[PDB]
Amino acid sequence: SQSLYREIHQLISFKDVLPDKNLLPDWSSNKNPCTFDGVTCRDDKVTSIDLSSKPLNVGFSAVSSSLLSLTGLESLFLSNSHINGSVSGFKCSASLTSLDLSRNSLSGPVTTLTSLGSCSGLKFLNVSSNTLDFPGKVSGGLKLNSLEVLDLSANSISGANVVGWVLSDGCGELKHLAISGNKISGDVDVSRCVNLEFLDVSSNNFSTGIPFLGDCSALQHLDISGNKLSGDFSRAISTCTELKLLNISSNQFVGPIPPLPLKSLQYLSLAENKFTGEIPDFLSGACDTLTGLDLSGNHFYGAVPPFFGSCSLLESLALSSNNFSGELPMDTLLKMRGLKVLDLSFNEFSGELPESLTNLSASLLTLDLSSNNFSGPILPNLCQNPKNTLQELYLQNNGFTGKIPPTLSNCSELVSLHLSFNYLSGTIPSSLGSLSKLRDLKLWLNMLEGEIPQELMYVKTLETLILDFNDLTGEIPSGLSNCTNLNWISLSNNRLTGEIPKWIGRLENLAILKLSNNSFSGNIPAELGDCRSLIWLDLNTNLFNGTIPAAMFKQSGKIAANFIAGKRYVYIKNDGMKKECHGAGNLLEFQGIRSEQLNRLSTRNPCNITSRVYGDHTSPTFDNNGSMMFLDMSYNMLSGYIPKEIGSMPYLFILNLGHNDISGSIPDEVGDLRGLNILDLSSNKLDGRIPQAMSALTMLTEIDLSNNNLSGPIPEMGQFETFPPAKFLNNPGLCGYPLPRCDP
Ligand SMILES: *[C@@H]1O[C@H](CO)[C@@H](O[C@@H]2O[C@H](CO)[C@@H](O[C@@H]3O[C@H](CO)[C@@H](O)[C@H](O)[C@@H]3O)[C@H](O)[C@H]2NC(C)=O)[C@H](O)[C@H]1NC(C)=O
Ligand SMILES: *[C@@H]1O[C@H](CO[C@@H]2O[C@@H](C)[C@@H](O)[C@@H](O)[C@@H]2O)[C@@H](O[C@@H]2O[C@H](CO)[C@@H](O)[C@H](O)[C@H]2NC(C)=O)[C@H](O)[C@H]1NC(C)=O
Ligand SMILES: *[C@@H]1O[C@H](CO)[C@@H](O[C@@H]2O[C@H](CO)[C@@H](O)[C@H](O)[C@H]2NC(C)=O)[C@H](O)[C@H]1NC(C)=O
Ligand SMILES: *[C@@H]1O[C@H](CO)[C@@H](O[C@@H]2O[C@H](CO)[C@@H](O)[C@H](O)[C@H]2NC(C)=O)[C@H](O)[C@H]1NC(C)=O
Ligand SMILES: *[C@@H]1O[C@H](CO)[C@@H](O)[C@H](O)[C@H]1NC(C)=O
Ligand SMILES: *[C@@H]1O[C@H](CO)[C@@H](O)[C@H](O)[C@H]1NC(C)=O
Numbered sequence: 254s255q256s257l258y259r260e261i262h263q264l265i266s267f268k269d270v271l272p273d274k275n276l277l278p279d280w281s282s283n284k285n286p287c288t289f290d291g292v293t294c295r296d297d298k299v300t301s302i303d304l305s306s307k308p309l310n311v312g313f314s315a316v317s318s319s320l321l322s323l324t325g326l327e328s329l330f331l332s333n334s335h336i337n338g339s340v341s342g343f344k345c346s347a348s349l350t351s352l353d354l355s356r357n358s359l360s361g362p363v364t365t366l367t368s369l370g371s372c373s374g375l376k377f378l379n380v381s382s383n384t385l386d387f388p389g390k391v392s393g394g395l396k397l398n399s400l401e402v403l404d405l406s407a408n409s410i411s412g413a414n415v416v417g418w419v420l421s422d423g424c425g426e427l428k429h430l431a432i433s434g435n436k437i438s439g440d441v442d443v444s445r446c447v448n449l450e451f452l453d454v455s456s457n458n459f460s461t462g463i464p465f466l467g468d469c470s471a472l473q474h475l476d477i478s479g480n481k482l483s484g485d486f487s488r489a490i491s492t493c494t495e496l497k498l499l500n501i502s503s504n505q506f507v508g509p510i511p512p513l514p515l516k517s518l519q520y521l522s523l524a525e526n527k528f529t530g531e532i533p534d535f536l537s538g539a540c541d542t543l544t545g546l547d548l549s550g551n552h553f554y555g556a557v558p559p560f561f562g563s564c565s566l567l568e569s570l571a572l573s574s575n576n577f578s579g580e581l582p583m584d585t586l587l588k589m590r591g592l593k594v595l596d597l598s599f600n601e602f603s604g605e606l607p608e609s610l611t612n613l614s615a616s617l618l619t620l621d622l623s624s625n626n627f628s629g630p631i632l633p634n635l636c637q638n639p640k641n642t643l644q645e646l647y648l649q650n651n652g653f654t655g656k657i658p659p660t661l662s663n664c665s666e667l668v669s670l671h672l673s674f675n676y677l678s679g680t681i682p683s684s685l686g687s688l689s690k691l692r693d694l695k696l697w698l699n700m701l702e703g704e705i706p707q708e709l710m711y712v713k714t715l716e717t718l719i720l721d722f723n724d725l726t727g728e729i730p731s732g733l734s735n736c737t738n739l740n741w742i743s744l745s746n747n748r749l750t751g752e753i754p755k756w757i758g759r760l761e762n763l764a765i766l767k768l769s770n771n772s773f774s775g776n777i778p779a780e781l782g783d784c785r786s787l788i789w790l791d792l793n794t795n796l797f798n799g800t801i802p803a804a805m806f807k808q809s810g811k812i813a814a815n816f817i818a819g820k821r822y823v824y825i826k827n828d829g830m831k832k833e834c835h836g837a838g839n840l841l842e843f844q845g846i847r848s849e850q851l852n853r854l855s856t857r858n859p860c861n862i863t864s865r866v867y868g869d870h871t872s873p874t875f876d877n878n879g880s881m882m883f884l885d886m887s888y889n890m891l892s893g894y895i896p897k898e899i900g901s902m903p904y905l906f907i908l909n910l911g912h913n914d915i916s917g918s919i920p921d922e923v924g925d926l927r928g929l930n931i932l933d934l935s936s937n938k939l940d941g942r943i944p945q946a947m948s949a950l951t952m953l954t955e956i957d958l959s960n961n962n963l964s965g966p967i968p969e970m971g972q973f974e975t976f977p978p979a980k981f982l983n984n985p986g987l988c989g990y991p992l993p994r995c996d997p
């Protein structure tokens with residue numbers, strides 16, 4: 254027939270408009286479309302097309318003209334296909350039921366989608382993750398009353414009462430309405446939508462009424478999270494007898510936990526709200542069905558009540574960031590057969606760990622008891638049971654004493670071990686080398702003595718080793734060369750010795766290296782320049798010597814460094830007041846630790862308290878090009894000259910080379926450091942003129958050139974007049990404002 258002849262010519266005309274011909278190489282003319290990649294056929298007729306995740310780079314007009322008009326096309330999946338432009342009127346086939354145009358660059362007002370009404374059989378529509386918007390006053394309607402599923406999420410839709418617009422010409426067929434990640438406000442009325450099962454209006458701008466649900470006859474999923482909502486949500490959902498998931502998290506709800514529909518409830522989040530009081534006993538009605546609970550980030554208190562024993566289907570229990578107290582309720586927890594994640598972090602649970610915690614090692618994937626007032630030892634009998642399924646053990650920021658148990662090596666599935674901010678003595682057990690799946694070993698601010706275990710070489714998966722603020726001794730073990738995936742090594746404030754080993758260059762994923770306040774010696778290895786991800790090098794307060802090698806900056810302009818983002822951190826900035834406090838600032842790991850317990854550092858660290866504290870979840874700025882961001886090598890015995898390659902790092906914020914024996918002049922290339930905020934070159938033997946090229950630097954917030962033998966006039970252009978005299982003092986030959994006038 255003509256429809257076969259039409260089908261092949263339409264498909265091939267689509268191929269021909271594509272900028273890249275190679276995307277559909279098997280598509281060709283005079284060949285059966287049912288043999289093509291992307292095509293589904295039933296009885297030798299095209300029924301579905303799937304060109305998802307292929308960079309087609311074509312407008313919607315090409316899709317509508319060629320593909321959506323094909324006779325008998327039932328579904329068209331073009332998610333992440335690099336389609337742009339706008340929807341408008343076209344001839345749509347009557348058989349088309351599903352259309353996925355998610356994750357594209359579609360633009361224009363959201364009223365453009367009304368022209369999809371041509372598709373008389375359209376039931377499923379996904380235009381999420383596009384750039385659609387709603388300019389001005391909201392009037393008319395979407396007029397796609399035949400849809401069972403509509404996903405308009407993660408657009409640029411900004412407006413009041415956009416939900417009434419979607420639902421204006423009826424919603425009797427609508428089963429799933431998702432419109433999250435927009436800036437929608439106003440009223441949400443879904444009372445006429447009597448078959449609605451799924452409602453997601455989350456991450457929006459609703460600060461008014463709770464959505465009115467009517468009889469709520471079919472509603473199983475209700476997500477109103479990430480808004481500014483308050484008021485009587487209890488009354489609004491009380492008729493919702495079928496409700497399985499209720500996520501009201503990240504809102505302004507207050508008071509105690511009110512009555513809920515419990516009989517079918519599986520997931521409940523009241524997290525990040527302003528809720529108060531104790532967990533009421535009426536939540537026992539959820540225990541036949543409750544799979545997940547989240548009461549994190551509220552002002553709850555008391556104990557976990559004993560009804561949770563009956564909640565035997567409960568997989569995750571998150572009671573984080575509240576004021577829960579008492580001993581660890583093991584009689585309740587051991588009865589929860591289903592429990593896989595236990596998150597009791599940022600509370601005031603107290604006493605020693607009960608012996609019966611050993612039993613939950615074989616069932617839990619995650620145990621988080623961080624930031625609590627737990628005392629006594631870590632249980633040596635943990636992971637005594639065979640088949641220990643435990644992946645994450647977070648015990649940081651407690652009052653734990655004694656040794657790190659070697660028997661922790663029996664948790665063979667363990668990916669993260671965080672035992673920081675405790676009072677732990679003894680050695681880091683050699684048996685932790687056995688943890689063959691371990692990525693994160695964080696033991697900082699304890700009293701750990703001994704050497705760093707050579708046997709850590711057997712941990713092939715090790716990504717972070719955070720051992721700051723301990724009483725550690727010996728050299729860096731050569732075994733750490735074997736751990737090739739290391740991206741964050743931090744051994745500061747110990748009594749470690751030896752050289753930075755030359756094999757450090759073999760660590761290709763290494764981003765952050767912090768070795769400050771130790772007795773490390775010898776030359777700075779040129780092999781640090783072989784590290785193709787290194788953005789943060791802090792070596793301050795050590796006994797390093799020799800010349801700064803030119804070769805360490807060879808990666809400048811070549812670094813791609815976007816593996817380390819997602820990890821929480823803290824940057825405690827130094828202020829130039831205390832002579833005992835050294836360095837620009839301590840970048841430190843900070844997952845699951847309260848900033849209020851940073852006062853614990855005071856007895857180990859001379860640097861003030863938290864003069865400038867930044868807690869901001871990591872995350873490097875650049876993409877394709879890249880360079881080192883932070884370079885502190887202060888308070889060592891470094892000699893020779895600063896090489897001219899020091900100015901080859903455009904992303905360098907901080908450069909502290911202070912308190913060394915560095916001679917020659919300040920290279921002119923320093924003016925190329927366009928991203929530089931801080932430049933400490935003080936207490937060296939630098940001589941000659943401050944180069945005029947440094948006047949091009951526009952972003953210096955701090956500078957220090959004092960205690961050198963610099964001469965001539967201070968540059969009058971740029972930022973030098975901003976800085977006080979003290980930053981240029983003890984430079985006998987140096988003159989010009991802020992210092993006195995240069996007289997010949
Ligand atoms: C490098 O690390 C060493 C050792 O941690 C630091 O020395 C320590 O500095 C702290 C804070 O100044 C001292 O704590 C003090 O303890 C006394 C009582 O002993 C107390 O009265 C003070 O109020 C303060 O809490 C600690 O004694 C001291 N330890 C040693 C072994 O000297 C040093 O300051 C750090 N250096 C840098 C550059 O950060
Ligand atoms: C840089 O330092 C190293 C290591 O020695 C440090 O300084 C010494 C004076 C002493 O205090 C050690 O305990 C320190 O660890 C120097 O290495 C040796 O230094 C000696 C002189 O003391 C010299 O005779 C050796 O040949 C050097 N070599 C060995 C093989 O250790 C190194 O010379 C210093 N470099 C510079 C440029 O000063
Ligand atoms: C849709 O995106 C494509 C992909 O770049 C755009 O096509 C080219 O864009 C560059 C941008 O500088 C133009 O100079 C070319 O002339 C464009 N080529 C063609 C064939 O159009 C396209 O302009 C985008 N369309 C819309 C409506 O934004
Ligand atoms: C309950 O709602 C919260 C808050 O909206 C969800 O957590 C967010 O998940 C989105 C992805 O859709 C992220 O972009 C946000 O960063 C998360 N926010 C927070 C505060 O964590 C959470 O996933 C929901 N839970 C369920 C089971 O649906
Ligand atoms: C959210 O809505 C309020 C009230 O209509 C409005 O003033 C505000 O600009 C909106 N915020 C955003 C982020 O769109
Ligand atoms: C948290 O609970 C403890 C222990 O009962 C109590 O002493 C403390 O005052 C509570 N915290 C707050 C902020 O109310």
Ligand SMILES: *[C@@H]1O[C@H](CO)[C@@H](O)[C@H](O)[C@H]1NC(C)=O
Pocket residue numbers: 710711735
């Ligand atoms: C560590 O690396 C060395 C040198 O590449 C290799 O011969 C040795 O077998 C490795 N050891 C382990 C335990 O992986």
Ligand SMILES: *[C@@H]1O[C@H](CO)[C@@H](O)[C@H](O)[C@H]1NC(C)=O
Pocket residue numbers: 875876877878879903
């Ligand atoms: C590096 O490349 C990125 C690509 O996103 C670009 O934004 C930036 O302009 C380049 N760096 C600088 C300093 O210009």
